[PDB]
Scaffold this active site. Structure first.
Site, PDB file in Angstrom:
ATOM      1  N   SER A 150      16.149  24.986  38.723  1.00  0.00           N
ATOM      2  CA  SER A 150      15.010  24.035  38.543  1.00  0.00           C
ATOM      3  C   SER A 150      15.546  22.508  38.399  1.00  0.00           C
ATOM      4  O   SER A 150      16.820  22.672  38.517  1.00  0.00           O
ATOM      5  CB  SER A 150      14.485  24.539  37.100  1.00  0.00           C
ATOM      6  OG  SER A 150      15.272  23.683  35.838  1.00  0.00           O
ATOM      7  N   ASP A 208      15.074  18.512  36.943  1.00  0.00           N
ATOM      8  CA  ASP A 208      14.456  17.506  36.024  1.00  0.00           C
ATOM      9  C   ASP A 208      14.118  16.167  36.772  1.00  0.00           C
ATOM     10  O   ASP A 208      15.255  15.681  37.196  1.00  0.00           O
ATOM     11  CB  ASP A 208      15.695  17.295  35.052  1.00  0.00           C
ATOM     12  CG  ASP A 208      15.956  18.320  34.289  1.00  0.00           C
ATOM     13  OD1 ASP A 208      14.957  19.026  33.847  1.00  0.00           O
ATOM     14  OD2 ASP A 208      17.038  18.374  33.498  1.00  0.00           O
ATOM     15  N   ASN A 247      11.235  18.525  33.711  1.00  0.00           N
ATOM     16  CA  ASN A 247      11.550  19.934  34.352  1.00  0.00           C
ATOM     17  C   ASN A 247      10.617  20.629  35.394  1.00  0.00           C
ATOM     18  O   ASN A 247       9.246  20.831  35.168  1.00  0.00           O
ATOM     19  CB  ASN A 247      12.057  21.081  33.436  1.00  0.00           C
ATOM     20  CG  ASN A 247      12.820  22.304  33.952  1.00  0.00           C
ATOM     21  OD1 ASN A 247      12.425  23.241  34.315  1.00  0.00           O
ATOM     22  ND2 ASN A 247      13.817  21.789  34.282  1.00  0.00           N
TER      23      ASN A 247
END
Length: 130
Positions: free
Chosen positions: A51, A53, A60
């Site tokens: 993922s 940010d 996220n």
């Protein structure tokens, strides 16, 4: 863009963040401060779960914005993660509001718990005219 402290405080205040769901502006500043140093181009990849940010708030990609490369990700703020990297933070603010409309509130960000929760956050909004 890298916001200056008071510059960001009034920008947040103008966007309806002072007390949004009980969260003072000082808290939002401490969060932005710790999450990115007030940097809107900030991005941190998480090799662990694949993922990323995004932005001044480091939102996220697994839950809040779609970047097309996060496995089984969701898009709760219904926004391209690209929107979180603009100099204009209106979209990032809408998304951060969406995040806090959840049960945890401002607690959703671990960095806030680490550096802002139960601490002296006045310093972030002093001299700012807010």
């Amino acid at each position: 863009k890298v916001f200056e402290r008071c510059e960001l405080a009034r920008t947040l205040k103008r966007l309806g963040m002072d007390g949004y769901r009980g969260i003072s502006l000082a808290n939002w500043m401490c969060l932005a401060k710790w999450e990115s140093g007030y940097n809107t181009r900030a991005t941190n990849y998480n090799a662990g779960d694949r993922s990323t940010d995004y932005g001044i708030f480091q939102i996220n990609s697994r839950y809040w914005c779609n970047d097309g490369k996060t496995p089984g990700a969701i898009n709760a703020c219904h926004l391209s993660c690209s929107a979180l990297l603009q100099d204009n933070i209106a979209d990032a603010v809408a998304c951060a509001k969406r995040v806090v409309r959840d049960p945890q509130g401002i607690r959703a960000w671990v960095a806030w718990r680490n550096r802002c929760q139960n601490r002296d956050v006045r310093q972030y909004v002093q001299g700012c005219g807010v």
